[PDB]
Symmetry: C4
Subunit: 90 residues, 4 copies
Amino acid sequence: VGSVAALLTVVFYIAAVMATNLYGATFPEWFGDLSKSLYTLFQVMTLESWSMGIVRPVMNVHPNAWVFFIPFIMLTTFTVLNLFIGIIVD
Amino acid sequence: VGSVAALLTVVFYIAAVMATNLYGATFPEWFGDLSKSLYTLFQVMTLESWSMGIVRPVMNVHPNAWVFFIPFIMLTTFTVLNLFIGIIVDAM
Amino acid sequence: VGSVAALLTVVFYIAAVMATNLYGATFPEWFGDLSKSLYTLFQVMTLESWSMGIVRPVMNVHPNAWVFFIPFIMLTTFTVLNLFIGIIVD
Amino acid sequence: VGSVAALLTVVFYIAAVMATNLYGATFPEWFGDLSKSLYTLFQVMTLESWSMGIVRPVMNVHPNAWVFFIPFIMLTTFTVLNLFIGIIVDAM
Ligand code: NA
Ligand code: NA
């Protein structure tokens, strides 16, 4: 549980630095700075408007952006599910 | 299960009083009164339009509002998941 | 599993008859007929746009409509979760 | 776990070929090619905007499209849930 929760903040800082870098100058509202990018990656993590709201407009500028966003989900939405199950078991 | 379900209504009254207070006069549609604030915090709890719909417009007036909304989710969306698992366990 | 799956179709016919009746003439796009009402109650069941999309516009005409929609969710989104767990166990 | 993960990519190729075929010429933005159709079926799989965003506009042209989209969900959103549970079990 402890080793998993730490890995999640590490993955969330590496993606939040990257999302600010790649889609910063192009999408300043959602990917302006690290904090802006953290808040928006979390929105994508809870699945809220992930595709139609953020993931789709970004592809219209950066067509390959799905390589960033789809794997992040297949990871973060698995991790959190595994982490929460770990809490109940322990 | 009983001790958890009661804690959920307590957390939902403390946040519903707070959400009406902080974002009331500024966002009367979603945070006008306790009932309005209860219904909207629940929308945030089920994750439905949470960010793009409510959480984002509120930050454009109250930039720190994320300190209220992100923790509420990391709590209420964990509690309900743990509560529902508790029901199934206390049956088998 | 069998006794639960049958209860779900029964609850989905009683609500689909009711939703067509209450919010029919007022909201014909989403609650016109039984089938229209079934499809829309399912959208509410998967939580997709449930509040901002359907539940909110309906309250602006029928203020108490939340008494119909919130309990339906606390039931159908629990039932399906319990049913799917039952399949994996059996 | 291995036999389930392979079945998921097989179901996702059979639907992605079909979605491109049926709703291609009519909905080129979301169902233009196999890749476009894969990405959009996945959006439907995670439930994100599934109904109000994609499933509803498509029915206004193809009224029976719900026969394609509702079963896909009752399958893919069950499979992934069962697959993820299989991973946790094959670890403890
Ligand atoms: Na969701
Ligand atoms: Na959503």
